[PDB]
Amino acid sequence: NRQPTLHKMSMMGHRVRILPWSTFRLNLSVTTPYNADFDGDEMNLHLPQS
DNA sequence: CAAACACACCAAACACAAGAGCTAATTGACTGGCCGTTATCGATGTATATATCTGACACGTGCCTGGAGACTAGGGAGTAATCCCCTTGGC
Ligand SMILES: [Mg+2]
Numbered sequence A: 001n002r003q004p005t006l007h008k009m010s011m012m013g014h015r016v017r018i019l020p021w022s023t024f025r026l027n028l029s030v031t032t033p034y035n036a037d038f039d040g041d042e043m044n045l046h047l048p049q050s
Numbered sequence B: 001c002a003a004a005c006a007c008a009c010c011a012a013a014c015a016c017a018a019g020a021g022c023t024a025a026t027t028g029a030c031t032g033g034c035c036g037t038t039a040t041c042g043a044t045g046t047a048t049a050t051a052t053c054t055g056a057c058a059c060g061t062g063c064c065t066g067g068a069g070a071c072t073a074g075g076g077a078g079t080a081a082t083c084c085c086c087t088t089g090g091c
Helices: A028-034
Strands: none
Touching: none
16 A cells, blocks of 8 residues: 555555565556655555454 | 514634654753751760879988097006015925
């Protein structure tokens, strides 16, 4: 999720993949819904426990 | 005249002002009265240090008594002769 959640397409599930360096990554096509810009954005990540 | 409602106006409040995310730094109560502990000032000593006076011992000076010195007066102690009393000695 990205902090300003304007519409439904702003909190979608994803499958986890662990990569060496310390930065969230996501395919560029999925940038448009979130309205992210990879210019120092921040995007939250919640995990269900059930 | 008094009471009903309606309208325009004035006066008084309520709540909102996107989602959030990170970092920094300024504020660290205070006079006063009073009780409770404790430090200090004060008296009332008894122990020890020092000063004055009295007592015993020491060195020194002294007043007094008796002893000692030089010199004197004049007579006590004492040679040298004599008598003859009396003792020792004898048959
Ligand atoms: Mg951007």
